[PDB]
Amino acid sequence: KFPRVKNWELGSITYDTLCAQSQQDGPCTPRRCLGSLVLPPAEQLLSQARDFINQYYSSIKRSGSQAHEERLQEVEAEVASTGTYHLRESELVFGAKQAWRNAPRCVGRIQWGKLQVFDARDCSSAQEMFTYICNHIKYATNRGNLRSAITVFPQRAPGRGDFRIWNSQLVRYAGYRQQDGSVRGDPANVEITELCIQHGWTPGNGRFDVLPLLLQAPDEAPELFVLPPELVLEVPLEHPTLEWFAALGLRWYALPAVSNMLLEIGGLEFSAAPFSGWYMSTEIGTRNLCDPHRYNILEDVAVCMDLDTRTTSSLWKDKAAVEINLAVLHSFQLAKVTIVDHHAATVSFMKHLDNEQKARGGCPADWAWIVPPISGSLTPVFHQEMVNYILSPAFRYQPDPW
Template sequence: MDLKRRMQECDEFFRLPELAHLVPQRRRAALEQLEQTGGYLQTAEEILIGAKLAWRNHARCVGRKHWRSLKLLDARRVRSARDLAEVCWQHLQMATNGGAIQSMITVGPPRQPDGREFHIINSQLIRYAGYRNGDGTVIGDAANIRLTEFATELGWRGAGTPFDILPLLISTPDEPIQWFDIPPELAREVELEHPEFDWFAELGLRWHALPAVSNMNLEVGGMTYPLAPFNGWYLGAEIGARNLSDTNRYNMLPLIAEMMCLDTGSERNLWRDQALVELNRAVLYSFRRAGVYIVDHHTVAKQFCDHVKREEAEGRACPTDWTWINPPISSGLTPTFHRYYDPPDLDIRPNFVRRDFSGDGGI
């Protein structure tokens, strides 16, 4: 991002109503420092406000009704990969919160004027390994094969089970890439069972409690924070209708259909749909039984429509990517499906922006 664009974003940021309580000199001082040095020191308050607004502005998030609830863990002074890993463990503990998930963001050092940066290579703080077999089959999460192979090249060794938790890989300007095993007590998982099918628990399915995204930059007021893992809580369909169902992930629907004794000879039998519903029932039931907060797609869709109405009442646009805010199951039964939205604004700031992974071998 060129300096002119960053100066413009800085100026616009300090003119936002949410920062109207700051003295005018603060905006001028930030602009002057940014122009002279290529960066400036934001206060924790400014970062937290910016992160909340980034959540509110992010067109692909259906959970934006709760944008005001975000909490900040300020890690900008940390300089080593090991210390950054310790901060991430703190994030996991605080955000998981015994199952009463709370939305959090951890912000590390900003991108330096020379382009060097601190960042996490994993797409989320907690991810399952994927192992490619010689016959083309995969054990574990096929989406993470390349990351698993990369971690293995660095010296990590997994047990080879379908749900091995990958280490956290951290890149810093002055160290080789470091990997750190996530403490088991911080990676809370939910073993999946079904409210009616006793055989379901024997499938050995599970999922982690916290969806902490770690592959996006936080861009606030002309500053970029490449290390900025953040989380809300899971939408049940993310796990049941995508992670465990997609053919390029765990692809569990054929096995579940077989266990349900469904006729899979024809797509017209809708056996996939039946299996999908029961898998999603199992996810919601298991999380609830384990005391871990999760939301269903009907509830979150209504919450998002309420959020859009509130934003309209405040005179604000609500940029929305229709293809992302509708659930991957029973979309037509949710209120988000049957309306239009403000088109996505890819240039709106503050925002979370997908990071370019070219420096990490395309992982």
């Protein structure tokens, strides 16, 4: 039975029929819903391959053409003989865009057709990965006029170990574990900071020390590469009216570039395929700076604003958070670096849901991730029912390589 999807603000109703194209299972069953959880042979590869080839030629209107049939035989021949096959560059470009389009947790999908795709499948060493990573950052950063991009390194092969980027993002601040349990810097990065030191990085001692990359070619120890500081664009944070805010010395980097997820296209797996767009302000201002287990700066800001910390019912937390998000937006605007606030972002996601309804008969969307972390019911997406499911091409989680 096809899910009846309701918007509770407008009273309007759609049916998701795209979900019937899901061949991959989620965490839920009839007995118990698990959607808020954050983490989880040839014939089988061959059917994923054909389905993806089908998707591709259909995308270009050439379904059933000579080109389509010869391509299917090519894939069939390659798999039967070698247990694997390879994508053409245009197929890869199509699959990368489709993976983003299909990503249930991403609120920036209105953008999905505008993705710069660097083919790095001819990469043979960590040194080469590094040069590719640098060009990606250079291109994507674009002096603050951010552009969405993905770089795709060589696929997994039954023989050997994977190409991997050990870092979870290409740009990450160090977290230094003190002996007295506390952390200087970003607590989310304690373990990666520690790995870098193991592999011979000289650590700094600041709150915003940019980490080096740990790049690993197949069956080789990962190698260390410091990013050239001029490649990493950063925004000093200040507030439009509160002068003391700048004194906090807060900053954030411009480029959100995820570097630990696997890209699956047609049953092929790309263990290193870092990707990037631009930030939504709440990622920085709410989660990264205010999570109790991150920089956790809410009390500092509240004390500065002279708020009554002694009681929850003064909404000191809520007031501080708002000012922090505002500073992020202000400082990024002042520095001419691309950013989108959570109101503009969710408004455009609504438009996206509507495009997808017309094009595909639905849109996989994970409500808990799409609704922003402050002012939820203030945005239109809170009021919109959403159906979550896995379509392929997909970005998947994979184990940490250590």
